[PDB]
Design a protein around this ligand. Structure first.
Ligand SMILES: O=P(O)(O)OC[C@H]1O[C@@H](OC[C@H]2O[C@@H](O)[C@H](O)[C@@H](O)[C@@H]2O)[C@H](O)[C@@H](O)[C@@H]1O
Ligand SMILES: O=P(O)(O)OC[C@H]1O[C@@H](OC[C@H]2O[C@@H](O)[C@H](O)[C@@H](O)[C@@H]2O)[C@H](O)[C@@H](O)[C@@H]1O
Lengths: 476, 478
């Protein structure tokens, strides 16, 4: 085979997107519990707490909390070699600032992790995934507050210890670089728990939180390895490679400066220091960041073991916008459409070839092992009279990507730990809080009005993926 | 009130021993590879003759007699106010055949006198150990750098120079533009980079990779002994940086660009990181290229990484996926590249893209986080002397000006770490590619034509006083 024997095939999810039981076992209100439903072309509403008259899809989600044994069993039917999820911060520390963790909460993950380990499924765990306690947001302002660093490090330490011999693979902060787009409220609210107000420099406040998180990460990495040196602790960034529209030298420069801005987090996770261009940017913009000598030391001592990343699409930038003499990157303004590729009904361009670019790029910059912890295809699914979703459009997409990651390993020589398709069981979509935007090999009976039996049934892609794993990639 | 560039920025001018020196037999200097290369023209290759052949014109034999003129010439460098001066040590001046037990004293003394003369004016020498001029005996007798035995010979040479000049030269580089031979389809680079003489049947690519590996090992070893002799020496690598742009956002074009860069600059990853990128090893399998490569070599490479990246910039390239039957995205420099439709070009069809210099600087910075040194940049054009007795080379001034502006942006806005800036061919010399005098790069005009005649008189061009003023104001006033 072309992939190494122990290659980690699996499937990915996040606590707040699937678990449900948002109030069970003392679980506290998380940022996710206050975001209402939306849709393609309509933003999710972020409320000042749980308001009457609103629908909050994450509250009940797909009730994985009461269903996990049945679902894990399916994951084992496909033959997962691993399973990625996050530990819900608000199940361990309801409000965030407690001196002691919620035991019921630790127990739930004990029970979940034991369940996977029965079938030989190695857990892969993300510490923060879009679900910090909503209390740290109201009470402290989220990761704008330096003291929240220690709250995260407490939470991580607790988690490392309880699971030091059950969980081999960890990631600190989910897609730490989504907030690179400070222009809208989603990323800053979910990466970082930032609610903006009048006169706030949104960009300035984003960089501070990002810095606190990068520093929280480096401290957590360090502490993990002390507890169990064998732990593998990685970072996690959303990779959307950014292509220059043409060989016009300005487009070229725009592309390079955009990548630099979108992925400086990686350089810090990896090299242990900020690149010079960020400081130059801050000076230019008069952005001041609370950045200490101790921070600088934590960052250099807390670099990651591998890079985990999501991949769904690629972008294209050009130099069309004038009044940009410094070549700033505006995610909401500088991006144009790639004429050479197709897209989803949500307009996420489909570019499997970009997965290979990405893998090569990470490899060339960083020379660390890599882990595709999210890749997937969100689409409308229908049920055929035969009772099964025939999702060949999903199979085609996953398929084309696998073929490219294999080329990268076999022809290019990148070290890739594994591959984890995203939303492996139908779940509440992050960007939209939509059920109708489905990603799973497994269909869950529930719609965007929250009606349905919630019964699960396999999709056409279920057996397909099963054969993929069993063939270790030789059968696409 | 500070400048955008550091106060100790190393402004200077660059050349190579075999293109200006002459005295190609003086002091027992041996025949080098350049001494058997005839003169050419744009479109017409120089001829690589087997030995020095009667009835053939070899322009490097006399060049501009800098060997006799150096003192007055260095005086001109001082007049413009150079902070540094870059040249190479002619290998064949130290080891005429290359395999001697003991070095040549007269050759050593020459560079002693030359370096002394620079320092009399406060000009810091920047030295390149191998610059397209290895001993020709090593070609005929050993097969050049295709022979593991030449690693030793080179390191012995590096060692002698490091010793002799350990308190005179602070800035060194090992192999000039070591990556040119990435273009192995044509004879030039492989023969100048590496002393390779191909015959019918050769796997040109495979042989290039071997010589390159040996030079990379020889480079690591030189770095290590240089530092042992004096840990303060700055010893760098030297690569030709022609950045390679994808034609369009077609993913296939994007990938051709990334893979081309990977192919053309792996040299740098080795110099900097101290090991090969995996993609090379993978590539070598697909091609069944066998490279003689010991654990000892592994160790040397990993331990002799460089202090800084010296590079040359002249232009940007463009690539696309138009070529058929390339399912693995191999890179052929003579076939995959297309013209940039957005820029202008010199009379020798070199494209002018100063913004590409800024891209280059960020690329090195992003990949390697080392100090960079722009050690060659220049504009080759036809000069004519006006009635005031001076060449009015505004074209040159404009070219250099534009590049300098971009590099300032890289520093002042992008934060790259740049040690200095060395316009190439600061004095009119014999060109690499063509062995031409008419392709002038200089701030200083040398009266000598392509038929070998002229008084060899030196005189300032208009750019002379321009550069002087660029330096005096540390780039403030371009
Ligand atoms: O549910 P969604 O909206 O389809 O998102 C998919 C899945 O991937 C990750 O985020 C997806 C993307 O959402 C935006 O922030 C940007 O377009 C991208 O940067 C980002 O990758 C999340 O990890 C996950 O929770 C999402 O459900
Ligand atoms: O060949 P020229 O006109 O002298 O210009 C090159 C000059 O700078 C450096 O570049 C070498 C060039 O040789 C050509 O054959 C290639 O096509 C170019 O890509 C390459 O840059 C040399 O280091 C120097 O010796 C040359 O004089």
């Amino acid at each position: 085979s072309k992939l190494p024997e122990n290659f980690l095939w699996g499937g990915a999810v996040a606590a707040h997107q699937l678990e449900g039981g948002w109030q069970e076992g003392g679980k506290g209100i998380s940022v996710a519990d206050v975001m209402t439903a939306g849709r393609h072309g309509v933003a999710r509403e972020i409320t000042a707490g749980v308001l009457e008259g609103k629908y909050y899809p994450n509250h009940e989600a797909i009730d994985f909390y009461h269903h996990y044994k049945e679902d894990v069993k399916l994951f084992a039917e496909m033959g997962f070699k691993c399973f990625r999820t996050s530990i819900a911060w608000t199940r361990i520390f309801p409000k965030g600032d407690e001196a002691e963790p919620n035991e019921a909460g630790l127990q739930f993950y004990d029970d979940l992790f034991d369940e996977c380990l029965k079938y030989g499924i190695e857990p892969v765990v993300t510490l923060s995934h879009f679900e910090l306690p909503y209390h740290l947001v109201t009470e402290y302002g989220g990761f704008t507050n330096r003291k929240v660093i220690d709250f995260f490090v407490h939470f991580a330490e607790v988690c490392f210890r309880r699971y030091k011999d059950k969980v081999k693979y960890w990631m600190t902060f989910n897609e730490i670089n989504n907030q690179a787009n400070y222009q809208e409220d989603f990323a800053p609210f979910t990466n970082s728990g930032i609610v903006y107000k009048e006169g706030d420099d949104r960009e300035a406040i984003m960089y501070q939180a990002a810095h606190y998180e990068l520093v929280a990460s480096a401290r957590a990495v360090k502490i993990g390895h002390a507890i169990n040196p064998n732990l593998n602790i990685g970072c996690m960034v959303a990779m959307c490679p950014i292509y220059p529209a043409t060989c016009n030298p300005k487009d070229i420069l725009m592309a390079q400066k955009a990548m630099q801005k979108r992925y400086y987090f990686a350089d810090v996770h990896v090299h242990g220091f900020y690149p010079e261009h960020i400081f130059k940017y801050w000076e230019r913009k008069a952005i001041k960041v609370d950045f200490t000598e101790r921070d600088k030391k934590d960052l250099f001592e807390g670099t990651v073991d591998y890079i985990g990343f999501s991949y769904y699409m690629s972008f294209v930038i050009d130099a069309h916008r004038e009044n940009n003499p410094y070549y700033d990157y505006l995610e909401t303004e500088d991006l144009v459409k790639n004429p050479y590729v197709k897209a989803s009904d949500w307009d996420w361009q489909i570019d499997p070839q970009g997965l290979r670019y990405a893998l090569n790029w990470f490899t060339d910059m960083y020379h660390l092992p890599l882990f595709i912890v999210q890749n997937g295809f969100g689409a409308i699914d229908q049920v055929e009279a035969d009772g099964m979703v025939h999702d060949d459009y999903r199979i085609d997409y996953l398929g084309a990507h696998i073929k490219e990651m294999i080329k990268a390993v076999d022809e290019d020589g990148v070290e890739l730990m594994g591959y984890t398709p995203w939303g492996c069981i139908d779940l509440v979509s992050a960007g939209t809080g939509e059920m109708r935007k489905r990603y799973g090999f497994i269909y869950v009976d529930k719609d965007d009005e929250g009606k349905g039996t919630l019964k699960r049934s396999p999709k056409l892609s279920f057996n397909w993926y099963k054969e993929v794993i069993a063939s270790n990639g030789d059968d696409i």
